[PDB]
Design a protein around this ligand. Structure first.
Ligand SMILES: COc1cnc(Cl)cc1-c1cnccc1C(=O)Nc1nnc([C@H]2C[C@@H]2c2ccc(C#N)cc2)s1
Ligand SMILES: COc1cnc(Cl)cc1-c1cnccc1C(=O)Nc1nnc([C@H]2C[C@@H]2c2ccc(C#N)cc2)s1
Lengths: 674, 674
């Protein structure tokens, strides 16, 4: 357990070494092993992969990613395939419970995210806690394994982690980069005729869709079917349904992939392309760091991405998806350029990725100091300075400025030992940023004074996150909804801070500039709009209805789903620890309702992993109002309900599943839950 | 009327030419003459001087200074001896009423205040408006006159104003300067033996009082009585009474003068020193720019003033008070120094005053743009650039940044042509700073939603100014008062924003740092404390009771009186112009109540200038519940009531007035009011 850090290009079986190491460590030490992943989609896919590969050895595999969580305690688990943000909370609770020795290893995937990123600092703190605790309390304590592409400072990361080094540039499908700048239809025909797929990357969502549409149009003009019809039917029966453009585009071996779609539609398209059913796929920058989806020929619409040169890291991870290891011999990554874009393309062709930064007065150092002090691992000044040396910023005097910020905001109490009073303890357990915890504390305390129980809107407003701009708000439609709102919802609107004057300013006048820090009251109205969307969401209204009523597309609504559910869980833990029992009770149900977008009655029924929001309503309408009830039922009954050999349903990480055996597994999983 | 600018040292009749100029202009053109003064005390003194000197020519002389105002329209007036703040409002209302030609002269006193100062910018804008309006609409339009000490750039100011120049350093009592190295006992003894006064200047207040006390003690130990006893009795019968230290210090020809005293006590001491009854006077930096109070020998405790070298302009105006024109031969100024202070003293001995700045993104330019736009004198962009050239900053591109700031805050509406909608018109007529008018608008609009009429506290909170730190707040006593507050007062406290949590933080914990702009909620609690003080003030409780209950001394309470009354008047005009009739009605009575610190019943009775807060209660208790009633009464009745040849009462600008003839003037003035 001397730790380890290694890098290798993707599409080269580079995760296999991690699988072997984790198997060895869990089987030998009988201790846990966190598998940290950047994104929730890749975390889900890796969790399914590890479940399949380690089911036959009595190894439990269930991670903490997104808003979801395992239905069993952390003790029973053996491998937790968590995301970066939730792995930090896992380690924090282990430290606070003084059960740190339960961990045997911590694998980290795609370590290049350590640098410039809005989540890498969480990875930095997460690994710093491990190194600090290992060195304070000791050969075979906690192994760390990392992955990345060709990092200019990989050896530096290994030195920080006190781990070995392995860097190699090898792939079974040698890529051939060749820039080139009529013959468009000829190129399309010659690439498609070879029986090989094409993965095109386009920055703009609308232009990506139109490009896929016109590729399908050219194929239709110049012009397996059963499996493609199966994919048609699978797309048809979805909560959002089938898109008009996608319907015409899919049956000519052309598809598109962007955040605008739902997670389920993205899964359908990814599976269709991976199986080879889809030949041409116009994806966007989102897929670049997404699930493993190799192709034969990669193409890029243009270096320009969002009014700027494309990130070199994005290009590096894009090229990895050009070549299939096992069926393909060679792979290509073509990059069209223009006269003015020739220089940008040439610059992008050469040069590896930029160095890894740290991103640490900054809120990250406040979070770090809070973690260490509340955890009880750095209580006095003498040792908190060693934590600075433990970090990657050091290995590559702001602590005092942060420590005072915490005492200024009463997060901790000085004694010269330090301790948390109540808000620091509740802030670390909730995994909330200490910067926003003061605002959350004020909003919760204000809410409990005059809480509105007539509807869920006041509860939703308090579990509505607004740390990112999840969508652009149309203030005219928002004013229409406001004037159409019931009075019960308007009482909470007045309570929170919404004013008809501000909406009147925004409906006609240009969006008011928030030049001054005092204009956080612009965030109040955006928060109220988002909370109304979330109320329509948990009311179980179709995504299309929420789209027309509010203008946010289904992909944005699903991202809001996940963010709101995660925030609701965090706020529930915050309230639980703060001693606010009534607030905790009112908030508890909302995490699951937000995760699944379901009513209170379906909450006891979505405990079965194989039950969507629609598949929970159909069973509830039939009479299965509880998982125990759903266990006591024959397979043919559920089969006929689902209907009212062909794979038509879809579930995350599915197999040759149809309406027949899907009903068989629904009842079987219900039995296991009981 | 070719304007004029001149400078000359004080104690040389520099103001004399002003009186002749005003007399000539007012008698010839029959137009008005605004005499602008820096401070309210000097404005009062000059108003009384001009009244005495021009009563025998049938000319009205009543100025707008402090919270007070004439009891007759501006039309009937001939000379308005206003202060800088209120002269700007006079000019603004003249411009808005398009009656600018009514003015014939604008004399300005102590023009060096135009530079670095928290009020000089108002003088700058006031003078800029006159020159702009004269040049757009024409050589007898409006004459301008100025005064100051030896300004390094007097010619520059004259060039800005397009006026002549006269600068001379002459004084009938030549001041000497020859350093000869506390050692004040013999110096004071030899000076007092010569039958000459001494004016000592001390930076600190408590140490100034102790310095007066020790000098009185040495005079008592080592070393007219009827007039000094008269001054004793005059000090005895005051709302604040007589200080313990002042009682023991006054009868040995020693007194002290600082902002801690009341305006009345300051007036008593100044009169006693001017008459020669007081020989030694320990004043502070406040008196340096105060009323004319010449002395034979000036002394300064130390160049260090407030932890820094004494301002050179302050020293220049101090030394002017060393020499009496007509009874003195040669005046002296002695500046004691030390080993470390020798360098500072020699530095301060040499070098005249610094050059005059302009102090013009800045709120001053926002105010200027607002004034010119709603005045209708600068509507289109083309001419607003000329205003910039008209300024003293120019004569010695931020307009666009300010113009957008006004449109950003909806102060004006764009059309090529700019106009005010409602808030700009109400802001300029209210003479409020447009920076704070947004907060005032928010607080007023919020108040009308949930107004509390049970007591005056909610009305006082809205007319409580907090633009300066009028006193240091003791949060322990404030918490005690909060505990003892009635529920009616606590409802308004909750409405405004006061929270028991913040007071709990402040009572024991150190004063919370307002590092963040979002912590204006510290100003809410200071505002509430000040409003409670103001409520006790208008409840007609003695100043000593307010001092013990709140800790603010009587001088601070009187400064708060004046500031709160001025702010109440401004807010009343703001509400009047905004169309808020109920708010205006509730606010109207409060300006006079704050000015005099009286109840509603005495408001109709303090219309007589001779009547004070105490002298209005004694008559009201007798039965004179109205000025008309007070007119219908014999002189002996009021004489006996006042009692229940010796000058015992005091009133601003008094004469050989006693209890007998004071009653005679009270009834006589009441008749004139009717
Ligand atoms: C408490 O914050 C959350 C609550 N809800 C959700 Cl949906 C998401 C979050 C969240 C949001 N943003 C960042 C991080 C988190 C997060 O940290 N989430 C966690 N999920 N599971 C955790 C461990 C609690 C379990 C535990 C119990 C015993 C032992 C032992 N021995 C070890 C671990 S923490
Ligand atoms: C409206 O602001 C105030 C109200 N209350 C008070 Cl106690 C003080 C103020 C104040 C505070 N800080 C700065 C300036 C002011 C201020 O502007 N004070 C004034 N008070 N009266 C004035 C003349 C307005 C009237 C007028 C002028 C010309 C003609 C003609 N022809 C007719 C009427 S201006």
């Amino acid at each position: 357990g001397k730790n380890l850090v290694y890098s290798a290009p993707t599409s080269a079986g580079k995760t296999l070494v991690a699988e072997l190491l984790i198997l060895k460590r869990v089987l030998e030490m009988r201790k846990k092993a966190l598998f940290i992943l950047p994104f929730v989609s890749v975390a889900k896919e890796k969790k399914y992969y590890l479940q399949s590969l380690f089911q036959e050895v009595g190894i439990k595999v269930d991670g903490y990613m997104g808003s979801t969580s395992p239905s069993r305690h952390f003790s029973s688990l053996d491998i937790a395939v968590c995301t970066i943000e939730r792995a930090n909370g896992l380690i924090n609770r282990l430290i606070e419970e003084n059960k740190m020795d339960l961990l045997g290893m911590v694998v980290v995937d795609e370590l290049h995210m350590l640098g410039d990123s809005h989540r890498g600092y969480l990875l930095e703190l997460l690994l710093t806690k491990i190194c600090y605790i290992t060195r304070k309390s000791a050969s075979n304590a906690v192994q760390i394994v990392g992955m990345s592409a060709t990092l200019p400072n990989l050896e530096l990361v290994a030195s920080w982690l006190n781990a070995e080094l392995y860097h190699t540039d090898f792939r079974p499908v040698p890529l051939l980069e060749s820039v080139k700048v009529d013959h468009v239809v000829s190129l399309c025909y010659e690439t498609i005729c070879d029986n090989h797929s094409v993965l095109l990357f386009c920055p703009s969502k609308k232009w990506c869709e139109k490009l896929a549409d016109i590729i399908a149009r050219e194929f239709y003009n110049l012009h397996e079917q059963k499996e493609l019809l199966e994919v048609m039917d699978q797309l048809r029966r979805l909560p959002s349904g089938l898109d008009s453009v996608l319907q015409k585009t899919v049956p000519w071996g052309v598809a598109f992939h962007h955040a605008g779609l739902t997670f389920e539609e993205r899964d359908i398209i990814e599976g269709a392309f991976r199986q080879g059913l889809i030949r041409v796929l116009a994806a966007t920058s989102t897929l670049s760091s997404g699930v493993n989806l190799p192709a034969r020929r990669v193409i890029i619409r243009t270096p320009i991405f969002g009014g700027r040169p494309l990130d070199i890291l994005t290009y590096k991870q894009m090229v990895g998806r050009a070549g299939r290891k096992g069926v393909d011999t060679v792979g290509e990554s073509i990059l069209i350029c223009k006269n003015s874009e020739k220089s940008k393309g040439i610059a992008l062709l050469q040069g590896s990725l930029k160095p890894v930064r740290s991103c640490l007065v900054t809120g990250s150092m406040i979070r770090a100091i809070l973690e260490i002090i509340v955890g009880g691992v750095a209580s006095t000044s003498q040792d908190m300075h060693t934590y600075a040396a433990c970090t990657f910023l050091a290995a590559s005097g702001a602590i005092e400025a942060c420590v005072m910020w915490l005492l200024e905001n009463e997060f901790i109490q000085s004694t010269k030992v330090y301790h948390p009073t109540h808000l620091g303890s509740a802030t670390l357990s909730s995994s909330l940023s200490p910067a926003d915890t003061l605002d959350i504390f004020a909003d919760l305390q204000r809410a409990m004074k005059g809480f509105v129980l007539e509807n869920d809107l006041h509860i939703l407003y308090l579990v509505t996150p607004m740390f990112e701009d999840w969508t652009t708000i149309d203030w005219y439609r928002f004013f229409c909804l406001w004037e159409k709102l019931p009075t019960s919802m308007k009482r909470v609107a007045e309570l929170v801070g919404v004013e008809e004057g501000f909406l009147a300013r925004c409906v006609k006048g240009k969006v008011v500039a928030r030049t001054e820090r005092q204009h956080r009251q612009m965030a109040i109205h955006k928060r109220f709009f988002t909370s109304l969307v979330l109320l329509d969401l948990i009311s179980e209204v179709p995504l299309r209805e929420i789209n027309q009523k509010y203008g946010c597309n289904r992909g944005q609504i699903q991202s809001l789903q996940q963010s709101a559910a995660v925030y609701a869980g965090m706020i529930t833990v915050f309230s639980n620890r703060l001693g606010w029992h009534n607030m905790e009770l009112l908030l508890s149900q909302f995490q699951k309702r937000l995760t699944f977008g379901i009513q209170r009655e379906l909450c006891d029924l979505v405990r079965v992993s194989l039950l969507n929001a629609q598949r929970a309503r159909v069973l509830y309408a039939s009479g299965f109002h509880t998982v125990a009830d759903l266990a006591r039922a024959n397979i043919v009954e559920v089969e006929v309900i689902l209907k009212n050999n062909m794979r038509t349903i879809w579930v995350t990480g599915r197999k040759g599943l149809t309406e027949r055996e899907a009903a068989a597994l629904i009842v079987e999983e219900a039995r296991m839950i009981l």
